[PDB]
Design a protein around this ligand. Sequence first.
Ligand SMILES: Cc1cn[nH]c1-c1ccncc1
Ligand SMILES: Nc1nnc2ccccn12
Ligand SMILES: [Cl-]
Ligand SMILES: [Cl-]
Length: 163
Amino acid sequence: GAMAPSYRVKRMDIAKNDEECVVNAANPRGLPGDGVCKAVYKKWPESFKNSATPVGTAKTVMCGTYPVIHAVGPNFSNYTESEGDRELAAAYREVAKEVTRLGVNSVAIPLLSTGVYSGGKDRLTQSLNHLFTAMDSTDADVVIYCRDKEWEKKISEAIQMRT
Ligand SMILES: Cc1cn[nH]c1-c1ccncc1
Ligand SMILES: Nc1nnc2ccccn12
Ligand SMILES: [Cl-]
Ligand SMILES: [Cl-]
């Protein structure tokens, strides 16, 4: 575990993380995809061997010794707000199980279902709160990645509100 388990936020490409493993915002089919998924495919293509997994699950595939945790959030274009919310919570619970199983001391995580799976809505708070619910009981250092300046400020404020 980390000496003093913490949350941090960074505004940068998650493919350039400084953590011991990465969470991919994957599609259920293990395709190169778009956004975070495409950056992860370019950096760790070997990790897409048999990476297909259902919505609300996470599947880890090694790239060398570096673990890529493929976490499949719901596409809110297809799911109801209610069913989507349950699958988004479930994906993060499966990420916490994988991070714990791997024994890493740090993990790089994106906000699942906030990009092309958002159904055209702002889901910063919804996604972040499900991330906290899952990861609060883990002792890895969690570094949350984002691309927008206003998202960085809102994520940083949410972390500080708890400390
Ligand atoms: C689209 C992309 C590529 N590398 N990282 C991201 C990213 C990270 C966090 N939040 C949104 C996007
Ligand atoms: N996850 C994330 N980071 N920055 C942004 C901006 C818009 C939508 C989602 N975002
Ligand atoms: Cl960057
Ligand atoms: Cl997304």
